[PDB]
Amino acid sequence: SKQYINVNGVNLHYISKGQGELMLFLHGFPDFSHIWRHQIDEFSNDFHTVALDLRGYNLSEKPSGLESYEIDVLVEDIRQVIEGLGYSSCTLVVHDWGAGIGWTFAYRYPEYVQKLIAFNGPHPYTFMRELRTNKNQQKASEYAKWFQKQEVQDYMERDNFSGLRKLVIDPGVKKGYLTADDVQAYMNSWENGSVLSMLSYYRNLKIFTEEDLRRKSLFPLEEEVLNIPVQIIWGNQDPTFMPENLDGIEEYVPNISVHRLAEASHAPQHEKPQEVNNVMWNFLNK
Structure with a gap:
């Protein structure tokens, strides 16, 4: 089903299926809860799978002002969602902006996170390391500076969200991992959400x-080491996050496993769902 939970001064929309321990999925830009559809279907027989629409996205509330989208606010959203759903902890599954938020949340509230499964996105410490020294990552991340400019909203929204279509829709349709119905769901999400x-x-x-x-660290943190079990599932062809983000990650996350997909790009979870799902099971069961 699709419904709402009131947290931290906003109404957030989410997809829910299954029962049991909470597996909470956090998407990034410019996706939404639907990106997790294959994991929702696979893990809902053994887990209560919940995929959140982050504030500002799809049917979730779209509060005004930059301050409404600061890391501390986003982290509190996640804390209240877990408790709001009736849990004291969860398996947290994260991607892109969802990973920026989720890593930060796991570091600050490790007691709320039984296990962490992270897809392509920034680890708080290694990401800053790569931004500082990795020329390829500096180039890859140049869009973040561009996103500061006022012209970008129009670029993303104009002509039936052409900027977003070119970013996510065109390659997914060409490569065959987005169906016509998936495309419609994405288009709806952009119409309903706020660029x-x-x-x-x-x-x-x-x-x-x-x-x-x-x-x-990308966002302020007290601790450098995260001691919970972590699984990384990483698409090697990602043009936004370079492979070196994973170098020496075990120094920051001692109990970590890494699986790299040679034939996936930014979003392995729906590019190669079967391979991903089997790795998730392997991690959850070991």
Whole structure:
């Protein structure tokens, strides 16, 4: 079913299926809960699978102002969602912006996270390392600076969301991992959501000045080490996050396993769902 939960001053929309321990999925930009459809179907016989629409996205509330999309706010959303659903912890599954938020949440509230499954997206510490030194990552991430510009909203929205279509729809249709119904669901999500809200996330990032690039973590953290069990599932062909993000990640996350897909790009979870699902099971069962 599809319904709402009131948390942290906003109404967030989510997809829910199954029963048992909570498996909470967090998407990133410019997707939404639907990106997790194959994992929802697979894991709902053994878990209560919940895929959240982040604030500003799809049917979730779209509060005004940049301050409404700061990391502390987003992290509190996640805390209240877990409790609101009736849980004290969950298996947290994350991607892209969802991973930026989710890693941060796991570090700050490790007691709320039984296990973490992270797809392509920034680890709080290794990402800053790569932004500082990795020329390929610097180029790959240049769009984040561009997203600061006012022209980007029009670029994304104009002509039936042409910018977003070219980013996500065209390759998914060409490669065959988006059906016509998937395309319609995405189009609906953009019509219902707010591109302004989506971009607002990026406009709070502190990765542009010299002093900010020197920070040890993407978002402020007390601890460098996360001790819970973690699984990374990573598409090697991702043009936005370079493979070196995974180098030495075990220094920050000692109990970690990494699976790299040679034939997947930014979003393995719906590009190669069977391979991904089997790795998730392997992790959850070991």
